[PDB]
From Swiss-Prot:
Keywords: CBS domain, Repeat. Transmembrane segments: none annotated. This is Uncharacterized protein MJ1225. It comes from the Archaea. It comes from Methanocaldococcus jannaschii (strain ATCC 43067 / DSM 2661 / JAL-1 / JCM 10045 / NBRC 100440) (Methanococcus jannaschii). Residues 10-67, 90-146, 154-209, 229-280 form the CBS domain.
């Protein structure tokens, strides 16, 4: 079937920033709009020139190569570094869809190009809209066979964080593996979840505005997972229906559920991208 992606796209206007928008302001925008994904456009002609997600912020904070903007150019000063324009840490060469793109293209793009959301552009590459894996799952939820089970879709080998792990280390794990969410596991048992969004929430805390002005930047990246993880996790289990799990994700704006034992031992993880393999 050939259904236009545009027929689904968030008919809300898309929140954007500009290349000269500071990292600080981009962070606030992410925070204020709850949107953890921001297209970078010209002011301008509205051409998509970049994209910045919470994962890019986690990179910048210590998880990857973008951290050297802080450590090197700005000699460990997180607060001066965030005055840098967003173009310094945004991803360029963006994966986009043409305004005539269809659902199957979007899905293939999500499944093969390891993205969860893509800007929809026209022929001038001006921003029209954006589509996420959630929008597609929401639109096709009642087209999932009610009997289809989650087993085949579960990612068995889970990359994990522990309650004692420092933020600077979990950030490495997230960025290196390209996983925004890590189940938190201790002695084989699920004790929580931590995501890249949590790291962003932390930066906009009173606790963090304190250490920055009178910090002690390092104390932010030294926080252990137990201090900030979500302890009570929406989990899935083998034998659960795929449609049930999918519905739970979409109705809660949650992208990932750790898959657990009745004893809370980790069997796997299932995410929105996995759900979309049903329509592969
Ligand atoms: N459409 C895109 N085109 C190019 N790069 C992108 C795009 N979307 C995200 N990225 C980049 O991918 C890297 C990982 O970010 P993130 O994991 O937040 O995106 P994602 O993989 O699309 O999200 P999700 O885990 O919900 O599927 C970041 O550097 C981000 O800038
Ligand atoms: N399975 C879960 N159970 C309980 N809490 C969760 C679960 N998954 C994520 N969270 C919490 O939800 C909050 C938002 O997480 P996150 O933004 O990474 O979810 P998401 O799938 O990316 O949805 P979105 O991309 O639309 O924001 C975080 O505080 C995270 O700890
Ligand atoms: N923590 C993890 N450990 C192992 N695999 C994971 C983890 N998180 C996600 N995956 C798998 O990686 C693939 C891409 O999923 P994705 O939704 O982009 O991950 P995430 O939401 O954490 O960024 C999926 O098959 C998913 O099950
Ligand atoms: N955008 C960036 N991302 C990562 N590291 C950077 C970035 N900008 C500057 N740096 C680091 O800061 C050092 C000095 O930068 P510069 O003074 O602008 O030439 C560089 O050698 C890099 O190691």
């Amino acid at each position: 079937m050939f259904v236009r992606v545009m027929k689904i796209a968030q008919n809300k206007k898309i929140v954007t920033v500009y290349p000269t928008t500071t990292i600080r302001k981009a962070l606030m925008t992410m925070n204020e709009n709850k949107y953890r994904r921001l297209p970078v456009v010209n002011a301008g002609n509205n051409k998509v020139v970049g994209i910045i997600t919470s994962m890019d912020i986690v990179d910048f904070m210590g998880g990857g190569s973008k951290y050297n903007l802080i450590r090197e150019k700005h000699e460990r000063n997180f607060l001066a570094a965030i005055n840098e324009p967003v173009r310094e840490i945004m991803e360029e060469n963006v994966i986009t869809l043409k305004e005539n793109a269809d659902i199957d293209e979007a899905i293939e793009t999500f499944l093969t190009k390891n993205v969860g959301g893509a800007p929809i552009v026209n022929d001038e590459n001006q921003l029209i809209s954006l589509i996420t894996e959630r929008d597609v799952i929401r639109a096709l939820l009642d087209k999932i066979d009610e009997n289809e089970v989650i087993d085949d879709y579960i990612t068995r080998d889970v990359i994990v964080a522990t309650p004692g792990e420092r933020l600077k280390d979990v950030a490495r794990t997230m960025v290196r593996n390209g996983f925004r969410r890590l189940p938190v596991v201790s002695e084989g048992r699920l004790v929580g979840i931590i995501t890249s969004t949590d790291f962003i929430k932390l930066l906009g805390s009173d606790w963090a505005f304190n250490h920055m002005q009178t910090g002690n930047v390092r104390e932010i990246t030294n926080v252990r997972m137990e201090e900030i993880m979500k302890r009570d996790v929406i989990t899935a289990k083998e034998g659960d229906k795929l449609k049930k799990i999918a519905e739970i994700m979409v109705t809660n704006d949650i992208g990932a559920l750790p898959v657990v034992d009745e004893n809370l031992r980790i069997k796997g993880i299932i995410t929105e991208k996995d759900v979309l393999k049903y329509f592969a």
